[PDB]
Amino acid sequence: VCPGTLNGLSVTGDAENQYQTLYKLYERCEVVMGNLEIVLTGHNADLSFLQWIREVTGYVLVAMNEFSTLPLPNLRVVRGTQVYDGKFAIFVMLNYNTNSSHALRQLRLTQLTEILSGGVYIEKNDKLCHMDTIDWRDIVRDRDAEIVVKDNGRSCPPCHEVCKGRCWGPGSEDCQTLTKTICAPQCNGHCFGPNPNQCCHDECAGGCSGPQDTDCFACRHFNDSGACVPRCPQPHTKYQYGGVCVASCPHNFVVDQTSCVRACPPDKMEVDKNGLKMCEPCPKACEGTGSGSRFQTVDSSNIDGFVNCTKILGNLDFLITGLNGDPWHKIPALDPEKLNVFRTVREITGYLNIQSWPPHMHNFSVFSNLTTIGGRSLYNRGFSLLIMKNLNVTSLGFRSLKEISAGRIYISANRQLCYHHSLNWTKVLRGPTEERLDIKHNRPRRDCVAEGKVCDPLCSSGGCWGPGPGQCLSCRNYSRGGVCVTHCNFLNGEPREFAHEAECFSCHPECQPMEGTATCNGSGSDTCAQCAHFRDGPHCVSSCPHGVLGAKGPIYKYPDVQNECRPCHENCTQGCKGPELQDCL
Amino acid sequence: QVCTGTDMKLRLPASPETHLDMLRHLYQGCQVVQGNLELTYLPTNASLSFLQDIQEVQGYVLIAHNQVRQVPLQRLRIVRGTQLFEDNYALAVLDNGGGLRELQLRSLTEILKGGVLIQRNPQLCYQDTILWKDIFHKNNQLALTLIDTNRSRACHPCSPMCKGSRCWGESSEDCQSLTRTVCAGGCARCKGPLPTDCCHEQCAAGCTGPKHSDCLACLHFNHSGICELHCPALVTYNTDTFESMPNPEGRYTFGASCVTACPYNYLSTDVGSCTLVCPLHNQEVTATQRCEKCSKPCARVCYGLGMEHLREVRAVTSANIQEFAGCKKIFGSLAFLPESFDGDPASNTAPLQPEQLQVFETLEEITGYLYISAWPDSLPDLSVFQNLQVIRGRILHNGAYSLTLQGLGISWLGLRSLRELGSGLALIHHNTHLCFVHTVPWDQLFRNPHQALLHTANRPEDECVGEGLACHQLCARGHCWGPGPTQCVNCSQFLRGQECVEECRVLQGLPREYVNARHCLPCHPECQPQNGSVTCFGPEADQCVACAHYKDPPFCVARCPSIWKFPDEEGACQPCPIN
Amino acid sequence: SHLVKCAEKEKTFCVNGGECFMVKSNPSRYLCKCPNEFTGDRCQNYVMA
């Protein structure tokens, strides 16, 4: 299994760099999670690493390259979930040198059995033979799909006699095997034999070994422990997650009618239950960017959609073209001050990817209120947090970040980035981290410590996001809001405090300061050791109450010689000096 | 073309005089029966031509105690056996002695579940000539057959043209077709002995061609002419992008076919199933109704007979009538039997009193049926249910009736609020004192094309006239539930507090009123009566034309308040300067 | 080969690299040859590791 590409005929580097990129991505790949694109490959390339590909999720594109054969002898299913030009699942174009010295002559797709979506386009290939000897309608599932196979070869040889007029090449080992156009009238699909009782199961793709839901190459919908099904078992039961049936939904996904999804439907919201989140019949639909969205990066025309956003339903990508503008679409450069619109965001459900930041900003303080980064959508594979090549950034600044729910971290090539060396990632990234951090080529530890770029002495062994108090994951002694201190003002200090969850909280304004012991045990009027002024039952007050309306109407109390308050006579006016009728004002 | 059939088994007709009309209204025009097909206790030469259109029965087929020579079911193709007659039987033909001579079931080629019981019919010919093994489905069945051959008739052998001597009757058109035991390879159904004659694996009765669009009957669900294993989901799932989406082509599951909406009186669900009862941990919600899941502890629900702890209870008695106190909607049925208002020496239960029936005064809706065969002789009407609006009939008495009144000493019905009979037939008979049946606009209460009123043995229309029993002269179109001015369906003039009158007392009279749509309502006590004009514009103290006592600017008041106000020279209340 | 250089009104299609090419092919088809450190259909993304 490997990820696919989406280059659309573009390439990176020279002929050797292009081959080495293609080789490493597909070296031992069986299932391509995206498109398979081979573009401008040289005649000296050894393409034998492609022999293990069995299934392609998107489209297969082979264009403007020169090599004799395309070695895909085991490719059976092309799903076509991504279609080139909106029409074609297989796209083969101009694969020959203009001097005729080298060209593509054979595709060798001898096991290609089913294309589930899209057509076939094979055009302008002067030396490509045997393309009009393939029954392409036996392979393409959709009867309305367009097939264009025309200008391919001139002097091509005939098929081997054993091929019965249908072949991929000049020999018996290259003959085409039919699975649909040779079936009994009753099948309506692929078969494993000519008899009416030898039709494949409806839920199976790429051909079958028997009539059952388990004797199949690949499934069309869900794989339930070997069985191909149109839906997972409903109320034992199972959840629908990414084409398989699972006993429970992953902790980082939200459940919607026994299915695990990245985000809820337009008419539902995420609600926390027991461990898992569920979608219920909403808050502002603050949608994200990147793959699966409307645009690739935050930009001068896109950033305005995040005003008052607290939770981003998707990924958040910052690419070079979203900061410096994009003349091809007439998009002006982004004003760096507009990045403060992200200070209201507390959660990102997908990945955070920062490849460029303004030249005068040395941190990411616009995300200081970010608490959770989700792993529901990842950048390529694995990675949910990506910070790379930011040459002016000295600190990360993620003060509030406590959990990354899933995925891998990529922090690299940031020549100024320093304080992260001290950061204990096991308390931020949920689960084992030994194989998930990939932190390389940032400011060396040697120079970071030698220049004094280290965190405050009150900061715990958990590490920190920057130079000062309040940027630590946890502190050694006490906090006062964000900022950490040596001690609280319990027994001394002009203001006085009490302990709660290792944070300092102030005592009630009416509380008497204590000498040698704690001033108070809470922020309430009835939580202080002694009353500073007057006592009204268990509560300390600045004076005894007058003009108060209760269950019996106006309430008035008078002070005693010890400053405790008592009710006035029932026939008094606006107060009294004592309990008797003659004490009334 | 869809109906639910009946649930009588071998019990006697409730009304032998209307039994044939009951069967005719339920089945006339049906092609698919959603329940059991029961044709029992029929008279000699009954008009049974309305049965000729039935092609599918989802439960069992019971033909019993009939005097007719033939039953016109030649079009019946499939019996699905979702409900069985007794232990493991789907077709039952019992005690039909006149009596039946031929089955004539020419189209019947499939039984999906249950056996065949044909007993004590001393006229029937070919019950022992049919190869019943070709009709039972390929899937594992007990497939038990009990065939009684004691016909006591000189039946002719199957037509000389009938290959293998297998037939349903004496004619050449009566031969059994063999569609399973003659097929090539492993095929469950076919058109003939060749592999090319095999039917698609989703066909049940057989086919006209090899495709899942060529089936005579679908094995699982009919998707608009295409037979399929599952009906399309309402909400789909993308395995590549991890999201759920509405399905533009999604359908609801109803019986053995797909529909775009649930039929009237059925509750939709979030999985596409159309049901009559919501699953455990849900609520019934209106919009059209649907079932929705509980996100917190479910609300208290009132239940009737046939539901929950009352499933085994036949009637309302002094031991359970208190369970309906304060209820507006009852989930279940109500039945009042001779046992309800009499004593039970075995269970030690006291009879119900007229004062205990008042527990239903708050009842507005019944989800099942209302069956009354006994009622106190001191109550001339059914006014205990005067606030009952809707009877859904989701549960029917004997599978046919939603409103039944038998043998009651009632002078008029009195059901003033009743506006809907959602499903089922209405049966009113043997009420020798009951007049006001023809005065009720029954055509405005029924919803389904298969509903009708069946009645006999009630007070004659000539006796209603002789005793002066007719609708009050203010009743719209002459429609009423009883003789009183409070019992009209609607009225041409003013309605007051549910009592129809000629005039609203606005311009004249000692008290004064105002008109609001079709109702006449009293003015606030502080409004001054205006002789020949308007007294008030509503029921409040600040809606008066003039004050009867003192004018306190915000409203008319009996006396100025003591804030402390005083009466002035114009009769108004003003704040006092002394405070 | 089968590629030519993009005209001055077309050259802004590719970013960071700028090596925009046109396929000589009835609809317009735009290519770019990216620097070693850039990828994507317009060369807009950095190459990882």
Ligand SMILES: *[C@@H]1O[C@H](CO)[C@@H](O[C@@H]2O[C@H](CO)[C@@H](O[C@@H]3O[C@H](CO)[C@@H](O)[C@H](O[C@H]4O[C@H](CO)[C@@H](O)[C@H](O)[C@@H]4O)[C@@H]3O)[C@H](O)[C@H]2NC(C)=O)[C@H](O)[C@H]1NC(C)=O
């Ligand atoms: C699956 O569902 C489909 C769609 O509901 C269903 O197809 C329907 O079958 C009925 C069967 O009667 C068709 O009804 C016919 O409509 C035509 C219209 O002109 C009438 O002429 C037909 O009349 C015949 O039957 C009458 C019965 O009394 C006779 O009196 C008359 O002389 C004719 O013999 C008949 O009413 C209906 O039109 C089709 N609908 C569609 C869209 O085709 C199908 O049967 C279901 N089952 C299977 C296994 O497919």
Ligand SMILES: *[C@@H]1O[C@H](CO)[C@@H](O[C@@H]2O[C@H](CO)[C@@H](O)[C@H](O)[C@H]2NC(C)=O)[C@H](O)[C@H]1NC(C)=O
């Ligand atoms: C359905 O999923 C199961 C896994 O749960 C697949 O079984 C695996 O198939 C691969 C194919 O090479 C083998 O290497 C594994 O060893 C198999 N695992 C087990 C437990 O047997 C099965 O092939 C899938 N079937 C379809 C149609 O996708």
Ligand SMILES: *[C@@H]1O[C@H](CO)[C@@H](O[C@@H]2O[C@H](CO)[C@@H](O)[C@H](O)[C@H]2NC(C)=O)[C@H](O)[C@H]1NC(C)=O
């Ligand atoms: C700082 O980092 C160390 C690893 O270098 C963390 O060590 C963990 O210690 C607990 C003690 O029970 C073990 O169960 C874990 O398995 C250890 N982690 C690893 C990766 O081995 C330590 O938790 C971190 N401390 C803080 C305060 O974050």
Ligand SMILES: *[C@@H]1O[C@H](CO)[C@@H](O)[C@H](O)[C@H]1NC(C)=O
């Ligand atoms: C929501 O957006 C408007 C845009 O002007 C802004 O004024 C307002 O303060 C925002 N609300 C909050 C709660 O931030």
Ligand SMILES: *[C@@H]1O[C@H](CO)[C@@H](O)[C@H](O)[C@H]1NC(C)=O
């Ligand atoms: C973050 O960047 C601003 C930019 O001027 C700078 O003033 C500040 O010192 C940095 N903060 C931290 C905590 O490093």
Ligand SMILES: *[C@@H]1O[C@H](CO)[C@@H](O)[C@H](O)[C@H]1NC(C)=O
């Ligand atoms: C949370 O958001 C507000 C918005 O201005 C900001 O002032 C505050 O510093 C943020 N808190 C933290 C811990 O970064």
Ligand SMILES: *[C@@H]1O[C@H](CO)[C@@H](O)[C@H](O)[C@H]1NC(C)=O
């Ligand atoms: C019922 O049928 C059986 C079948 O052989 C026969 O022996 C028996 O005598 C019949 N019963 C009567 C009352 O004739």
Ligand SMILES: *[C@@H]1O[C@H](CO)[C@@H](O)[C@H](O)[C@H]1NC(C)=O
């Ligand atoms: C009641 O009867 C009157 C007679 O004119 C008519 O205007 C009105 O629409 C009727 N309303 C109903 C609900 O039948």
